Amino acid sequence: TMRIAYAGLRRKEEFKALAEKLGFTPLLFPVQATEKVPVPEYRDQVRELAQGVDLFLATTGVGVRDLLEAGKALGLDLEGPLAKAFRLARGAKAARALKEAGLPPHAVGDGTSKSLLPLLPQGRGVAALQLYGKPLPLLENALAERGYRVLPLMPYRHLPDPEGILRLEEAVLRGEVDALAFVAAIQVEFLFEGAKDPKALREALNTRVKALAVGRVTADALREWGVKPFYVDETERLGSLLQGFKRALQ
Ligand SMILES: O=C(O)CCC1=C(CC(=O)O)c2cc3[nH]c(cc4nc(cc5[nH]c(cc1n2)c(CC(=O)O)c5CCC(=O)O)C(CCC(=O)O)=C4CC(=O)O)c(CC(=O)O)c3CCC(=O)O
Numbered sequence: 001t002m003r004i005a006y007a008g009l010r011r012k013e014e015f016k017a018l019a020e021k022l023g024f025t026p027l028l029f030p031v032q033a034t035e036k037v038p039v040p041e042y043r044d045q046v047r048e049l050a051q052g053v054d055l056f057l058a059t060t061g062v063g064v065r066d067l068l069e070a071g072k073a074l075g076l077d078l079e080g081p082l083a084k085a086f087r088l089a090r091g092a093k094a095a096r097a098l099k100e101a102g103l104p105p106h107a108v109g110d111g112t113s114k115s116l117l118p119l120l121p122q123g124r125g126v127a128a129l130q131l132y133g134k135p136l137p138l139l140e141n142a143l144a145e146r147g148y149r150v151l152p153l154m155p156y157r158h159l160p161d162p163e164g165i166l167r168l169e170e171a172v173l174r175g176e177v178d179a180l181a182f183v184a185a186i187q188v189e190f191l192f193e194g195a196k197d198p199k200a201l202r203e204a205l206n207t208r209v210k211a212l213a214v215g216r217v218t219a220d221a222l223r224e225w226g227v228k229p230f231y232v233d234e235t236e237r238l239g240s241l242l243q244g245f246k247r248a249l250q
Contacts, residue, residue: 002249004212005029005168005177007187011238015181018242027177029168031190033159036133042155043074050076054125055148056085057116057139058105063132064097067153079103085128090116094130112217113139122146133158134186158186165194172204173197179210179230179245183238185221192225202226214241 005027006015012028019026050071058064071078082103089095091111098105109115113136120142127143129136131154143150168191171177182188195201202225205211210230213219219232231248233241 001025002178003027003176004179004181004245005171006181006183007031007168007191008181008183008238009034011183015238015242018239022242022246024242027171029164029171029180031161031165031168031187031194033161035159036156037159038156039154042070042153045151045153046070046074046078047076048126048151049128049153050074050078050081052081052126053085053128053151054123055088055121055127055143056082057088057090057127057129057143058094058098059090059113059130059136060132061093061097063130064094064101066132066155067130068101070155086121088116088119112220117142120146123148125149126151128153132156160190160194162194165191166196169195169197169201172209173200175208177209179212180205181212181214181238181241181245182218182222183214183241185215185217188218188221188225188227198225210245212241212245214238 003025004019006012007029009030009032016026068078087098087103087105089098089105089108090113091109095105095108107119109119116139124147127148128151129140131152133156140150172180192198205227211222211227213222213229213232215236216234219229222229231245233244
């Protein structure tokens with residue numbers, strides 16, 4: 001044998017080593033670019049945050065930490081404004097980061113943007129939305145619906161690897177791969193947004209090539225593109241997906 005393509009970037013050497021040990025032929029087809037691009041307005045947005053906001057929404061633990069570090073690098077007091085804000089955490093990791101900063105959240109979702117919808121207050125003012133490398137339109141528009149002016153805090157843009165996506169699509173369509181492992185929802189997005197033939201690609205991943213998802217969020221992204229995942233690891237570990245996929249196959 002099974003040729004398994006990995007759409008990931010970070011753990012590609014770990015994936016290769018473990019796949020080989022489990023009797024697979026690993027293939028590395030990252031769909032994200034190594035380069036992040038800074039968001040020019042970000043420093044200005046953190047300075048605005050420092051002026052006080054009504055809501056603060058945290059999406060990731062790493063994102064929370066990085067925002068707090070950015071406030072320090074800029075010589076600002078963020079903990080004061082954040083202490084006064086009504087704070088939401090999208091999931092436990094965002095929540096844990098807030099708690100560790102002395103800023104425990106007032107509401108926590110289940111790790112999905114959608115789980116925050118019922119938790120959002122109606123009101124007026126500024127809602128600061130912590131992001132890292134990707135916009136969250138469902139949540140951003142939901143905030144505007146609720147009456148709030150949205151202040152994005154996205155330091156970077158995650159970028160696709162356009163030629164790499166095209167190569168991966170060809171490999172899938174030409175039968176060079178038996179399975180394709182996705183470890184983040186953004187990899188699914190990049191691939192289907194970058195595909196020359198997204199209808200053919202969907203068909204292949206439904207009929208010929210097994211789409212493997214590490215995590216429910218990744219699996220939901222496949223489903224939104226009309227792809228039924230062959231295997232979903234809800235342990236959310238790459239190692240576990242590979243062992244679990246081996247059994248599912250037989
Ligand atoms: O390699 C991995 O880390 C697993 C795959 C993964 C990727 C892709 C890859 O790395 O190959 C990935 C891409 C992202 N990195 C993101 C930010 C980070 N998460 C990071 C750690 C995580 N990667 C977590 C899972 C992932 N997030 C997850 C699981 C999750 O997304 O819930 C986390 C923990 C997230 C958290 O702290 O709340 C890290 C640290 C990585 C490092 O320093 O080695 C960063 C910053 C960085 O890219 O360096 C974000 C979030 C965003 O932009 O809002 C995303 C989008 C996630 C998605 O679409 O599902």
